[PDB]
Amino acid sequence: DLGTGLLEALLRGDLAGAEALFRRGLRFWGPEGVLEHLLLPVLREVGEAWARGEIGVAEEHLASTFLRARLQELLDLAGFPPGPPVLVTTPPGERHEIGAMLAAYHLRRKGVPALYLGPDTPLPDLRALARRLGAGAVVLSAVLSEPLRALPDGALKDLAPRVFLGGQGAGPEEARRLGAEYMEDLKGLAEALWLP
Amino acid sequence: PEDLGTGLLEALLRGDLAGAEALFRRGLRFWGPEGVLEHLLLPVLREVGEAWARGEIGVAEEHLASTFLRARLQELLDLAGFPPGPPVLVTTPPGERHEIGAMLAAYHLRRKGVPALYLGPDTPLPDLRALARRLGAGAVVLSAVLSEPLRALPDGALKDLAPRVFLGGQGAGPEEARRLGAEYMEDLKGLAEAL
Amino acid sequence: VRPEDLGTGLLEALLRGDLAGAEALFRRGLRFWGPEGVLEHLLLPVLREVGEAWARGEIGVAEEHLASTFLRARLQELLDLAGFPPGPPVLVTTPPGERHEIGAMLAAYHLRRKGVPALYLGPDTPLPDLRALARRLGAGAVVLSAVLSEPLRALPDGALKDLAPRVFLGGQGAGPEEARRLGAEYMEDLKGLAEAL
Amino acid sequence: DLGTGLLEALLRGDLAGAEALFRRGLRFWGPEGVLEHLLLPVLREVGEAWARGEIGVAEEHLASTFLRARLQELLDLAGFPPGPPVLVTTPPGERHEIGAMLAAYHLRRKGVPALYLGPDTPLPDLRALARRLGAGAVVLSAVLSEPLRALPDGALKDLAPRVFLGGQGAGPEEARRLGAEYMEDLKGLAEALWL
Ligand code: B12
Ligand code: B12
Ligand code: B12
Ligand code: B12
Fold it and tell me: Rounded distance, CA C178 to CA C186, Å?
């Protein structure tokens, strides 16, 4: 409901009003709630508005940068607990960061030390870092399907002892082909990781 | 203080984000906001860049460090004043994905009471002018790390994005700014003075 | 710790002398509510509980001093992150005899956040000295925060008139009538202050 | 003449310039050094200028508030170690804070958990806080002598097992009368406390 107001504030360059509206939502729904009720709907509307030609790239950039900033702040508010890290990123060629940041946030909320790398990490580099840090897991967020299609069979299999793949670009069959565990629900990710 | 840069980078490369945050706050408290960016954030960023280019670290390690430093700068940006009145749009040229210079410029402006709107990097020029016109922006500021994206632009391309257009970063120089129709500025402090 | 509990947590941290813990809780609040929000939803409620606990006799002045000093330091830190812009300043202080500084610092902070060069002088400034500084710096306004009403009672009618081209008075110690008596504009909401400029 | 420059910046309301000069001093002399070479000489010049009538109370206030803020930041950079605290304040009626903050800083630099309360604490309330926190010591800074003269004999005696009094307002006889240990040198404070 609040999404229209927030987007209108952003598109008129009223940063203070956007942040105030976002804080109101955060106070009302709480951290998880504001992400499902406000952040994600606005992100989606920005996407759709762009594709319809109602807004241009500058406006989309402004809105996306604002939402990233808000999500980064929630990520840091969940804080960084001890223990072997989980590396969170996106496949090579994937620049959509929000899904990855959400996954890191839901993990940290459950006491999992999710290290958000940013998007678009080469698989050998990722595997090397996981090995060196003794990471328990790698979590990948895929918005587009093409970057997954470009990977060879089994490519995600041994990035770390456990590898999870989600996002709208992914499905069970493609996860199976790549050797990743497929997950749709962020709230359950920590439990899936703690389980064998 | 002499050791904060080494300490911060080592903390990052071992995935000690809590340690890295504490060291960065120490730098912030010692040097102040502008100072920590000059004396800590930028030297560490540069070292990360050079280590990558020498092949000493991979992209995952660089990403870890870079993402953390971006987050810190964004946080300072949001703590600055955002005053009302005609904004200044801050971004990078099309094809330029290095964003930290643009964020720094937005930060220095906000610290001086200029309503700098950071768009993120890599904004098409027709879209930038549309938003500048629609918001009645007084200026556009572009940060260029690489020179190639500027060379790809036609003469006069930046000329009337807004009433004033500023170009800086290591990718830019006075001649290229003149060719593109932008004002060249080398020092971030001088940017705010120019307005 | 739920946001609803950060106030209790922060006060408990202070009352046991755990400054490191208090700072962590305050940063959590800052990240959750944002800069203005943490002041309204954490700093001010804690200060009020401290005040009420003192009046009930549960804590003394030393505990209040510890909490006030800590919260002042946090607000000062936010003030210095806002950046100080150029242009004719707004001088921010409290009336003579008024040693409560938080209201004044809050006013300076809200102004700086909106790009107004609010110069915080500290509290308790003699009126002739204040007027002299305003004219020398060409200050566009003076802002006074009054927590208690007694320091305003001590001032003669019209005392705040033309300290500067605009003079604003607020805080729990002030009301529109005392403001009218003293020759100041009354403002109740810190947000309205920036708009008035 | 960083000190001259800093004071001139403050008296003209150039807070950004004053902060930059202070950071320069901090970077050159370091934490202890900037206090000796910059903070204290400026405070004394402010004092002298006021007494000569060259500046008013508003200017003094502005400079004092700025220096307090800088010293609070150094206090927080020193950190707060664990263990039973030392409470640092000033006598009732004493509103001068810098001396007390300096004492807290020298203690924290030596790993002593010096809790700065702010100035002007009633003695019963101070004793109650020391008791409740199990404080090992109380440290008082006195600039003026009158606030000490107003106190009854033995008033400071058992605020904690160790009670130290210093500052220009204090001396050995008055410390003896009040039941405090008199100390002149900040550097020596933590050593006095350990022995
Ligand atoms: C927003 C959006 C954009 C915007 C804004 C997003 C941004 N700023 O990051 C921008 C303009 C950025 C964008 C870019 C593009 N996108 Co677009 N746009 C969308 C839109 C509307 C939403 C996508 C999104 O980011 N959602 C948020 C993400 C986080 O949600 P999600 O993946 O559904 O994940 C959910 C769950 O799976 C879970 N989750 C996410 N990750 C993970 C991981 C794990 C492990 C788990 C358990 C859960 C989980 O959390 C999420 C919320 O519950 C969709 C259409 C739609 N309505 O869905 C397209 C869509 C993704 N876009 C599309 C396209 C084509 C593009 C572009 C290539 C277009 C172009 N020519 O530039 C570009 C850029 C390519 C690139 N790499 O740069 C297509 C892709 C089609 C395909 N077959 O792959 C889509 C699907 C449109 C459509 N319905 O046809 N897009
Ligand atoms: C530091 C650095 C980084 C930092 C960059 C931070 C950033 N710029 O966003 C990090 C580690 C993030 C990085 C990442 C990458 N970069 Co890099 N790295 C470098 C390095 C060492 C260049 C220095 C630099 O970026 N300076 C930082 C900026 C902020 O400083 P500056 O531009 O001098 O600007 C200063 C002033 O001009 C002023 N300023 C800036 N903008 C403006 C604007 C105005 C108006 C004004 C007044 C002032 C002003 O403020 C700044 C501080 O003083 C070079 C190698 C070299 N030159 O020695 C590469 C280099 C630029 N990187 C390169 C690449 C390819 C990358 C990566 C793709 C590598 C990777 N996969 O890990 C990524 C891309 C990430 C991204 N898309 O953002 C290549 C580019 C090759 C090419 N010709 O295309 C280089 C040349 C390295 C190499 N030899 O291969 N990089
Ligand atoms: C901290 C404190 C002290 C500290 C102050 C430290 C410091 N340097 O800041 C010290 C030790 C000095 C102190 C001493 C005294 N104080 Co006292 N203490 C407090 C306390 C806990 C502080 C309140 C505060 O700092 N901020 C809260 C203020 C800013 O909020 P506010 O006034 O509601 O104002 C709001 C708006 O009006 C607006 N605003 C503020 N200024 C301005 C300006 C403008 C222009 C605008 C638009 C808006 C605006 O912003 C605020 C947020 O919405 C309060 C308890 C309380 N409930 O406040 C008492 C309280 C004010 N103190 C009280 C008393 C009695 C005293 C003493 C007289 C008693 C004594 N001898 O100990 C002395 C007198 C000292 C003096 N002459 O100033 C009482 C007052 C009794 C009463 N209600 O009338 C209170 C209420 C405590 C209680 N009884 O519960 N105190
Ligand atoms: C700043 C200042 C104020 C500020 C204080 C603000 C603040 N929050 O800090 C304000 C505006 C409040 C102020 C007001 C007043 N003050 Co005044 N002002 C000064 C000033 C300029 C400070 C200078 C100073 O001494 N700083 C340094 C501190 C640290 O003291 P110091 O001399 O350096 O002592 C050193 C050591 O003693 C050591 N130290 C300190 N504490 C301790 C503790 C221990 C254990 C140890 C080992 C060492 C130690 O550290 C210091 C640095 O090395 C002085 C001018 C001056 N000559 O210094 C006056 C001065 C002290 N003020 C003075 C007076 C009288 C007043 C007022 C009475 C004026 C009035 N008309 O109201 C009021 C009284 C307020 C009160 N009730 O206490 C007189 C002192 C009179 C006297 N000889 O007794 C002075 C000297 C003015 C002058 N130039 O004549 N003042």
Answer: 9
Contacts of A23 (CB under 8 A, 6+ apart): C33, C34, C37
Find where tokens 């994937």 sit. A94
* Residue for token pair 């598109």: A11
> Which chain D positions have a beta carbon within 8 Å of C80's beta carbon?
19, 69, 73
Q: Are D156 and D109 in contact (CB under 8 A)?
A: no
Other beta carbons within 10 angstroms of residue B138's beta carbon come to 17
Query: Could you tell me the residue range of the domain that residue D26 belongs to?
Result: 2-78
Task: Please name the method used to determine this structure.
Answer: X-ray
Strands (E), chain A: 86-89, 114-116, 137-141, 162-166, 181-182
The reply to whether A37 and A99 lie within a common domain is no
Backbone φ and ψ of A163, nearest 5° = -135, 120
Choose the final residue of a domain: B33, B54, B79.
Answer: B79
- How far apart are the CA of A18 and the nearest CA of chain B, in angstroms? 12
B130 and B187 inside one domain:
yes
User: Nearest ligand, CA of residue C152?
Assistant: 3
* Nearest residue in chain C measured CA to CA from D121: C62
CATH of the domain at B42: 1.10.1240.10
Query: Closest approach of chain C CAs to the CA of A77, in angstroms?
Result: 6
Between chains, do C89 and D13 touch, taking CB under 8 Å as contact?
A: yes
Whether C61 and C13 share a structural domain: yes
Which residue's entry shows tokens 């998007």? A119
Atom 28, ligand 4: residue with shortest CA distance: D99
Stated length of chain C? 197
Chain C residue numbers touching B83 (CB-CB < 8 A): 85, 114-116
Whether the CB of D91 sits within 6 Å of ligand 4: no
D108 and D183 in a common domain:
yes
Q: Does A121 share its domain with A35? A: no
